[PDB]
Design an enzyme around this catalytic site. Structure first.
Site, short mmCIF file in Angstrom:
data_model
loop_
_atom_site.label_atom_id
_atom_site.label_comp_id
_atom_site.label_asym_id
_atom_site.label_seq_id
_atom_site.Cartn_x
_atom_site.Cartn_y
_atom_site.Cartn_z
N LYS B 109 40.64 49.02 41.10
CA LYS B 109 40.99 47.76 41.75
C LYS B 109 39.93 47.39 42.76
O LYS B 109 39.53 48.24 43.56
CB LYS B 109 42.27 47.93 42.56
CG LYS B 109 43.52 47.24 42.07
CD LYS B 109 44.70 47.76 42.91
CE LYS B 109 44.63 49.31 43.06
NZ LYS B 109 45.19 49.90 44.32
N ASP B 229 55.94 45.40 50.98
CA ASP B 229 55.39 44.50 49.92
C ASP B 229 54.95 45.10 48.60
O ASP B 229 54.29 44.30 47.78
CB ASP B 229 54.13 43.84 50.50
CG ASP B 229 54.28 42.33 50.63
OD1 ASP B 229 55.34 41.80 50.24
OD2 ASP B 229 53.34 41.68 51.12
#
Ligand code: AMP
Ligand code: AMP
Ligand code: AMP
Lengths: 314, 292
Positions: B109, B229
């Site tokens: 990522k 989150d």
């Protein structure tokens, strides 16, 4: 398998690190059909900053520059040196000392910026000269050129094949030019292995007994090499002469085993490239190592130098 | 021979980078314990190659590896061999900013500067926790973290063990948090959400006892770190639609669970936990997950 780069000085560790690192990179770099003019102006530069990491032996910070690495890879091939062997001689254990690899195969000299400069000027011609003689030469065989940086200080180094045998012991050495007036200083003469000079050599009636076949192939190299040095307008180099006394070493060996408790004259010519056996008709049974060093009255020297070296032999 | 041939030079720098740092680490003695400095450490290497080796690599670039001792220890605690990790990144260009190694084993990522700061923020406690759960957890498994400088531009990356199998293929995703857009709901890989999942009243038939015991200690740990989150990535591989179907190596597909008998393979892990109600987000996520 694990290399620690342990050395008495950081410079040395960085050297071991760099040869190791640059040889590995080369190993991913395809081997070119031929070399290209830019390969002679090329370089690799690596800068390391290792914070709170991997600092047992390496400094946290150093730089490593390799000059013209494609050229010296090919030079290595021409001289029949496998990159991995080279890599190992430098990295398996710290070089010793002007350095030698721990296994005595390779010399590593610290040199000037001007020397590095001079290497570049002569490098295209030197490479070509190594090709058309197939690596048969009394000249230094150059294997790598490097610039190390430690503590903001730059050190230049050139790696060569060793002149002396990596196994056989030198009992007497000369450095020869061929005039002026040259000898060993009472200072030198009183060192363990004095570097003697011409007048010392001539003054002691010293002669080397090699035999005709060998003498001819040697003199044919010396001729071609020194003409090359004349062409390149290079001056002041020498003929390193090392003498190994076979019987003397065997006795030294025997004394070496006895002490511990409490074959002779043989060398591989593929490794000990400058070594010649003495003629069966020699006073002593000897081994000689002869090569030209320090190439880093132009056409004169060629003659002055060449006539002398030619008279050492029989 | 490793060329580091890749579409983008940044992918080549990455291949060169992982290759270089893994090699370097192989000369670094594996220590008896990590030390506080290891969490503040890094390697930095600047490359300047004039007229040399420029076939695939840029001629000038930088590569920085964060906390290499810690991430190498993390690799070992996740049962990943360094040379396999190196091989996965390095034999062939990472694929498909979100990447996988060519063999689908590892995800790569791109992240932000603040992500990297957050990672430093949580790393010690994240390490201590992996130690304590003996590597068994649905949290992301962080294998390395790097910063690439190319054309004067810095990129941060975080390598993880893939959630989805590198062999078996997926026919349905879910992003549970406790719904899908139109332009998305058309994608080959539709990233559904909690509502889509409830809507079709789906519930993975399962193990669920242990899986949930794990998910719980995980989310309680995220809580104490005041993090939130993060989602639960859920994958669904259709059996019906050499090797047999439904066949997988549990030591490689570490999140995979074969469907029960009484039902009509599932891959499940917690993802995205570098985000920063915490204790709160915890139960909305745990309570909701304990449903499916
Ligand atoms: N490609 C080159 N051609 C000629 N001389 C060079 C080259 N690279 C370096 N030198 C010289 O070698 C010495 C050391 O160079 P540097 O690597 O810049 O420290 C200086 O005298 C340089 O001018
Ligand atoms: N390639 C070589 N192999 C072995 N010894 C060398 C080599 N080059 C130079 N030497 C010796 O090492 C020292 C370096 O020479 P100098 O350039 O005079 O400082 C001298 O004592 C030489 O006799
Ligand atoms: N075979 C030999 N050849 C030449 N010198 C010897 C030999 N054996 C002993 N020596 C010398 O005799 C002295 C005493 O030797 P050692 O017998 O080792 O005490 C030393 O100087 C040896 O170098």
């Amino acid at each position: 398998k694990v290399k620690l780069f342990r050395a008495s000085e950081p410079i040395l560790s960085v050297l071991m690190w760099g040869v190791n690192h640059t040889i590995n990179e080369l190993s991913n770099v395809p081997v070119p059909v031929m070399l290209m003019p830019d390969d002679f102006k090329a370089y690799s530069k690596i800068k390391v900053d290792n914070h709170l990491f991997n600092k047992e032996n390496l400094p946290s910070r150093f730089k490593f520059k390799e000059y013209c690495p494609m050229v010296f890879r090919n030079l290595r091939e021409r001289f029949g040196i496998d990159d991995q062997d080279y890599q190992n001689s430098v990295t398996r254990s710290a070089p010793i000392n002007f350095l030698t690899t721990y296994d005595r195969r390779f010399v590593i000299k610290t040199v000037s910026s001007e020397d590095v400069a001079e290497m570049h000027n002569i490098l295209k011609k030197y490479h070509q000269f190594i090709v058309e003689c197939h690596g048969n030469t009394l000249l230094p065989q150059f294997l790598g050129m490097y610039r190390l940086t430690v503590d903001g200080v730059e050190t230049y180094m050139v790696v060569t094949r060793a002149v002396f045998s990596h196994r056989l012991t030198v009992h007497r050495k000369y450095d020869l030019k061929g005039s002026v007036a040259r000898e060993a200083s009472d200072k030198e003469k009183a060192k363990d292995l004095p570097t003697f000079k011409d007048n010392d050599f001539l003054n002691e009636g010293q002669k080397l007994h090699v035999g005709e076949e060998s003498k001819k192939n040697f003199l044919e190299k010396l001729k071609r090499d020194v003409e090359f040095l004349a062409q390149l307008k290079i001056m002041d180099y020498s003929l390193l002469v090392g003498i190994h006394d076979v019987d003397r070493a065997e006795q030294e060996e025997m004394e070496v085993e006895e002490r511990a408790e409490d074959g002779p004259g043989e060398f591989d010519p593929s490794v000990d490239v400058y070594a010649m056996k003495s003629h069966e008709s020699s006073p002593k049974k000897e081994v000689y190592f002869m090569a030209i060093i320090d190439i880093l009255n132009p056409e004169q020297y060629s003659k002055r130098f060449n006539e002398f070296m030619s008279n050492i032999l029989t």
